[PDB]
Design a protein around this nucleic acid. Structure first.
Ligand SMILES: [Mg+2]
Ligand SMILES: [Mg+2]
Ligand SMILES: [Mg+2]
Ligand SMILES: [Mg+2]
Ligand SMILES: [Mg+2]
Ligand SMILES: [Mg+2]
Ligand SMILES: [Mg+2]
Ligand SMILES: [Mg+2]
Ligand SMILES: [Mg+2]
Ligand SMILES: [Zn+2]
Lengths: 93, 203, 95, 144, 56, 39
RNA sequence: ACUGCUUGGGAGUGCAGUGUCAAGCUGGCAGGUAUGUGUCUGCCAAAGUUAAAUACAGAGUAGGAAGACCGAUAGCGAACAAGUA
């Protein structure tokens, strides 16, 4: 699904309270960092002689996933972000 | 203040002179029995901290101990039941190596009563702790107020009961307060005290 | 010591007791220098020479590898404060 | 009293109220709270909705003694003032004085219609309590 | 040595742990007390009537 | 064990001051003391 | 540091192994979220003994007091030449 590379979506910022063209960037999930509260648990829990200690999800059924779109008005840094429908090939242009 | 010199000379175990002296010993100690009595401590100043006194009825012993982790003595290395309880090589003995050396000695020689042990040397394969056993029935011991507690039957095998300083180390008793509450009279005593089902008589 | 005003909250929150400044006992003497304990330790350093770590740090400290020294010491001491004092005192033994 | 159990009533009725069919077993579902997220899901969600999850910041080693701030309302200060002492308390006159630490209270919430003045003496006060307490002609005096 | 009242000192050559005395030559060198190492603690021994003397 | 006690008294200057804004300044003074340094 | 057990202890509660390994001339350890830093507070480890209050949850010795208990298929296996045949 082709998506515009820019959109005048509405802006919650006080500086705005208005429609503004938003620089669209696709949301790609950030790196899974080591010292996340719950990675430290999983690591502590994987220390020792129980093998795997938590389930590892294996069987995906979804082929697609929701395409979060981070946005940001020219005016300021704040990144409004909004979901779309599932697509096998999001690609803004 | 000769102790102050001999104590800081041993605080430099990594110094090449002390590293050389220790080298020759560990060589020299490898070619000796696992227990070896000494007429004198290798570390007179350290033995004396731990209560050794050059008196009749104080004797010193250098007890060897193989280094490295315990291999759990399951047959063919197999382990049964849950996967957690598997693992042969990596689980470690929950007991100190000063403790094990104080216990080897005190069990070989029930004649005596170990007071403390201290680290003496440690090559790749072995650690040597020189124990300071007291002989309970030497008259010098029996009659000295500073030491004759050891004579009392309550300390027959202090080390086997983990009462010596080493055995208090792995027993967690080097910590008062919130770091050793689950541990504190004993891990066992802590357990009774928390796992008892108290029934107050009138509830 | 600063009087603590009777109010419950604030920069002196307490019951207005007349506080007694005090401290001397013996443990406060740990804060004091042991001039004699250094005289001894200085006598042992010029006896035993340097540690394999302590030499290995000065080799770096010859070169402008200052940061690779305390950053080598912290790995060898654990404390970063201890890593600094050692590199610190070494900086003099090299001076 | 064993006399009163319906164990004792249904002595003779073979299945003790557990049914001829659908027999009284053991653990027809799991021990305790088993299947709280499965076959007892309809149950916890109906009755114990918040039961599963995590909600907030942790407070490692909570110490409740420092947190101890029990409250008494203006509307309840007659519980502390002596009825005899409280007898005549004009706002412009002398007032009963009520230390609240003595009585075990810390903050003073300003609930109902206080009307008899008192010099309440407490560690904390509500915005509305010190106001009400003044408008009645009394006065909170801060203590600790 | 430390009080430097000593005006000569005689470290013995051999000692069970040389550590007992290993520092001593550096300590006389520091207090500028004359010192000498000598062949046997047994000879400092008999010299003092003891069966061994680590020092004199 | 000796301890304080109080009798009873006419309210004086107490009637004017709100002890809350007194209580709350002194609490806020400590509570935002670190955050008012950086500003 | 790594590993492993352990703990309510959670970027580590205690421990152990191995490597590494201090400080005491802004000391050291604790201050229940890591790090570097600055204050402050309590402490002073790595040696030792130590009664009482406590356990006796399948012990003994010598006694004693009991019971809303059992009452010979019960109460201990054992009311008896019972841990006997
Ligand atoms: Mg029926
Ligand atoms: Mg029924
Ligand atoms: Mg049936
Ligand atoms: Mg049923
Ligand atoms: Mg059915
Ligand atoms: Mg919670
Ligand atoms: Mg566990
Ligand atoms: Mg100490
Ligand atoms: Mg019978
Ligand atoms: Zn905007």
């Amino acid at each position: 699904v082709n998506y515009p590379k820019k959109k005048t979506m509405y802006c919650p910022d006080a500086r705005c309270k208005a429609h503004k063209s938003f620089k669209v960037v696709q949301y790609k999930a950030g790196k899974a960092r080591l010292y996340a509260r719950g990675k430290r648990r999983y690591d502590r829990k994987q220390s020792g002689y129980g093998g795997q200690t938590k389930p590892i999800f294996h069987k995906k059924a979804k082929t697609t996933k929701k395409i979060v779109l981070k946005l940001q008005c020219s005016n300021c840094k704040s990144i409004i972000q909004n979901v779309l429908k599932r697509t096998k090939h999001f690609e803004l242009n | 203040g000769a102790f102050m010199y001999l104590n800081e000379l041993w605080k430099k175990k990594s110094s090449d002179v002390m590293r050389f002296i220790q080298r020759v010993r560990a060589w020299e100690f490898r070619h000796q029995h696992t227990v070896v009595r000494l007429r004198r401590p290798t570390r007179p100043e350290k033995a004396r901290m731990l209560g050794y006194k050059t008196k009749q009825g104080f004797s010193v012993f250098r007890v060897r101990v193989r280094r490295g982790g315990r291999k759990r003595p399951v047959h063919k290395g197999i382990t049964y039941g849950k996967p957690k309880t598997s693992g042969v090589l990596g689980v470690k003995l929950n007991k100190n190596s000063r403790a094990i050396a104080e216990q080897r000695l005190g069990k070989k020689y029930g004649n005596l009563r170990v007071l403390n042990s201290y680290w003496v040397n440690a090559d790749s394969t072995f650690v040597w702790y020189e124990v300071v056993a007291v002989d309970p029935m030497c008259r010098t011991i029996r009659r000295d107020p500073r030491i004759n507690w050891i004579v009392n039957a309550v300390h027959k095998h202090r080390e086997q009961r983990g009462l010596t300083s080493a055995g208090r180390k792995h027993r967690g008793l080097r910590h008062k307060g919130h770091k050793a509450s689950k541990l504190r009279p004993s891990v066992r005593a802590a357990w009774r005290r928390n796992n008892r089902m108290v029934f107050l008589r009138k509830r | 010591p600063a009087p603590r005003t009777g109010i419950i909250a604030g920069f002196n929150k307490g019951h207005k007791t007349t506080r007694r400044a005090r401290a001397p006992s013996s443990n406060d003497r740990y804060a004091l220098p042991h001039k004699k304990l250094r005289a001894v330790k200085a006598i042992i350093t010029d006896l035993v020479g340097l540690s394999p770590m302590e030499r290995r740090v000065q080799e770096l400290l010859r070169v402008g590898k200052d940061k690779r020294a305390l950053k080598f010491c912290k790995k060898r001491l654990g404390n970063f404060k201890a890593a600094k004092k050692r590199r610190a005192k070494m900086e003099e033994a090299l001076r | 009293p064993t006399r009163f159990k319906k164990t004792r009533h249904q002595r003779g009725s073979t299945f003790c109220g557990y049914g001829r069919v659908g027999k009284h077993r053991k653990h027809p579902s799991g021990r305790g709270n088993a299947g709280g997220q499965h076959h007892h899901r309809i149950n916890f969600d109906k009755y114990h909705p918040g039961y599963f999850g995590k909600c907030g910041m942790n407070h490692y080693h909570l110490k409740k003694n420092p947190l101890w701030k029990p409250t008494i309302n203006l509307n309840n200060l007659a519980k502390l003032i002596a009825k005899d002492e409280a007898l005549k308390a004009k706002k412009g006159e002398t007032l009963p004085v009520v230390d609240l630490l003595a009585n075990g209270y810390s903050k003073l919430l300003g609930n109902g219609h206080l009307q008899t003045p008192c010099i309440v003496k407490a560690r904390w006060v509500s915005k509305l309590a010190d106001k009400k307490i003044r408008k009645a002609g009394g006065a909170v005096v801060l203590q600790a | 040595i430390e009080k430097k009242t000593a005006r000569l000192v005689m470290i013995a050559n051999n000692v069970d742990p040389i550590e007992l005395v290993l520092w001593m030559p550096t300590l006389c060198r520091a207090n500028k007390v004359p010192y000498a190492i000598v062949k046997d603690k047994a000879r400092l021994g008999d010299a003092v009537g003891r069966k061994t003397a680590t020092c004199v | 064990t000796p301890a304080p006690e109080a009798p009873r008294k006419v309210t004086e200057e107490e009637r004017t001051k709100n002890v809350y804004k007194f209580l709350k300044k002194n609490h806020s003074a400590v509570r935002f003391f670190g955050i008012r340094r950086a500003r």
